[model samples]
Target: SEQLKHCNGILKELLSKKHAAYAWPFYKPVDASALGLHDYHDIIKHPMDLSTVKRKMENRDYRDAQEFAADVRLMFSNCYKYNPPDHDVVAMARKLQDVFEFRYAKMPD
Candidate 1:
């Protein structure tokens, strides 16, 4: 519970924001059909999102801060691979990753 508290707080901040590096595309699972991401699954075998992370947090699925960090980083990594390097989604993911880095650095060991 001790370590989870900080991880959850970070997720809360990432999702709580109204704008400004807010993760609009990561709020839910990626819908390939809606976005015409036909090759999404083929490329990204492991799909992740903020809502899924929240659910995992509530379920206490993470063994420690590192595990939580893995899931969160995986979500952004997916974005980087799925979207074009110059795409807006990549830009947003990079911005969100920056925030995650800062908050993650503060989580008590």
Candidate 2:
């Protein structure tokens, strides 16, 4: 469970950056969406675009690594808050997080 533990830690740190705001983040919170962390806890923005995820993956922008981590963390939080993360959304998020973690580690020297 060490890898899971590591992913969990990374996810926690990423989501904590805005955990105080949104009840459920469909994806990474944008700069404008950052306000949810302060007092807009009920604002439900659109779910994250999967297309954006594909592009980011193609570009290999590790910056979105944090975003991906935050996204799955929020998804899992919401799952427990509402249900369990056994749906397509949570599954995809988890898959992406695993891939992103691996890609981030194997970045070019």
Candidate 3:
């Protein structure tokens, strides 16, 4: 319990940002009640309204192709973090292509 609490303290301090941007990606969505005040780690503040912030992030426009590609690469990396990505680069690409289809009316051929 002590070790876990200590680690949470360090993580809480590390993610002490005005928007709580760093830790936001790891969680599905902000749950203020679940993320309620902690006596030991008070650095992570819950956003008053996550829907607005989520919409803002979702609508972000990348600077250029390289930035867009980097974002795609990061998405792939996140998808394969636990699942073994070995010998399946093309398969992963195809899978993501299918996902993109739902998000776009016309994706790259």
Candidate 4:
């Protein structure tokens, strides 16, 4: 909901750098065989990785907060779609998404 210039606040806030250690599952795009996750690629055609998100933020490559939010949404959406609520993957998704949503909700439309 913001112009490109000030979107960094939301981008930086989407995830905490301190949380990086525990975010292994979302740090990078999954190599399907690495986890042997069933129907992973089938469920998510283009997974968004937190690392990529961070790089994009650092590179200042996003067009706007709306586009950045979409990628973040897509990443979490796939997590919810692929994993049951009982799974840790979904938990991380929930945590990360909640962080972003909180900040996003506060942004001016």
The model with the greatest TM-score is 1
* CA lDDT of each prediction against the hidden true structure: 0.88, 0.44, 0.37, 0.73
lDDT per residue, candidate 2, 49-88, as tens digits? 3334434445654353455555544444443443346665
TM-score of each: 0.93, 0.30, 0.28, 0.77
Clash counts for the predictions, in order = 0, 3, 0, 0
The sequence of per-residue lDDT tens digits that candidate 4 reaches over residues 5-109 is 445676654445755544557777878888888778888888887778878877877867777778878888888888888997788778777777877777665
Off by over 4 Å in 4: 1-6, 15-22
- Please identify which of the two predictions, 3 or 4, would achieve the higher lDDT against the true structure: 4
lDDT of 1 by residue, 7-87 (tens): 998999889765444588889999998989899999999999999999998887888989999999999999888888999
Off by over 4 Å in 1: 18-21
- What ordering of candidates by TM-score runs from best to worst? 1, 4, 2, 3
Clashing pairs for model 3 are none
Highest lDDT scorer: 1
Candidate 4 residue pairs in clash (backbone atoms < 3 Å): none
